[PDB]
Design a protein around this ligand. Structure first.
Ligand code: GSH
Ligand code: GSH
Lengths: 204, 204
């Protein structure tokens, strides 16, 4: 199957999809759409929104998928990255939900004039952000292995790395000297997934 | 097992958990915590946040669960409400993600003075809300059965009903004469789940 991932230029919602395929060792085509080209392409995308995934097989079948984390969960399940038991499934989902909570705080800062952007950053960094980082640390602490859940890569590992990258976009040193569990998780994940480490280093 | 669901007084994040147990016919204890009693109870809750679920078996084991939709997904999976195939799993998750997007627009209106609350309501109702309602309508259209995904209740059905209830909290008539798929889905769901219909009618 040819898998084409269609998104805007950056690590936004598509990152969960990209990292899942990378970690699972699945080949795919990147299609980054520029702001200027979007109006033309928008009507050709079922549902008119990105990320979208177009899967084409060698017998002419075309499957369109939308909703970034639903795509990511589907692919993760296919490649045994959603937990091997019900309990591990719950713990995978628990960390995804916590990471997504944190992501929504980050979202508050987007498409705002610099002036109120810094006010929001200060608000969230003095409010919900450290609360969620600690809660995530507790989730990581409870793992029986080196990763979010056990010793094998799950979607939870991938969503966490992406959201932490957004936190450090807001304040580069926010995690410095703090949250040892999150730092250790990043080390362990990159150690366990050379494919992901290479991907993260290569990223434009 | 005794299942105790702990939340604040209302339909907020706990609703997905409550509706899942109701639809699956699982008995549980409701524990609603008042604003005034929260400070005392907060330290006794692992992670210090609600919803939380405490499950106690008849051999003294105590299991604590947090993160509302991770709990809901876990319970839904246990009771065959997350899809019967990978494709149905994806479609369940697609509608959950769409419904949660809509929920986050609703969240924008919370804990705001009446003045800017109405400005935000007008903004979202003229912006992302109708966009997401239509996208949800398309998801429903693509079902092979009467419900969100097939003919049997899934977590997607339940999350959708709860989020639509929040939209109508903001504007009672927003769906009137519009979004026929959403109206039909509500009818079909209540028809298919007398347990849920009774629960929704009884709600305080
Ligand atoms: N629930 C999201 C929704 C994606 C979304 O918000 N897409 C926006 C990203 S800019 C979009 O494509 N918007 C407007 C447009 O397509 O014109 C997902 O994770 O896929
Ligand atoms: N991701 C959410 C997080 C829940 C949450 O935001 N809980 C708030 C609801 S008011 C809370 O308990 N907050 C503050 C406190 O416990 O003092 C979930 O769905 O469970």
């Amino acid at each position: 199957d040819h898998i084409k991932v269609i998104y805007f230029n950056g690590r936004g919602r598509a990152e969960s999809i990209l990292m899942t395929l990378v970690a699972a060792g699945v080949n795919y085509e990147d299609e980054r759409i520029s702001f200027q080209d979007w109006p033309k392409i928008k009507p050709t995308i079922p549902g008119g929104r990105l990320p979208a995934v177009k899967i084409t097989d060698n017998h002419g079948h075309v499957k369109w998928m939308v909703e970034s984390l639903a795509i990511a969960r589907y692919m993760a399940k296919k490649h045994h990255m959603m937990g091997g038991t019900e309990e591990e499934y719950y713990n995978v989902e628990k960390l995804i939900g916590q990471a997504e909570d944190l992501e929504h705080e980050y979202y508050k800062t987007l498409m705002k004039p610099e002036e109120e952007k810094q006010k929001i950053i200060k608000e969230i960094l003095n409010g919900k952000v450290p609360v969620l980082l600690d809660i995530i640390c507790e989730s990581l602490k409870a793992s029986t292995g080196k990763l979010a859940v056990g010793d094998k890569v799950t979607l939870a590992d991938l969503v966490l790395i992406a959201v932490i990258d957004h936190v450090t976009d807001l304040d580069k040193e926010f995690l410095t000297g703090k949250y040892p569990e999150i730092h250790k998780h990043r080390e362990n994940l990159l150690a366990s997934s050379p494919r992901l480490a290479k991907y993260l280093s290569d990223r434009a």
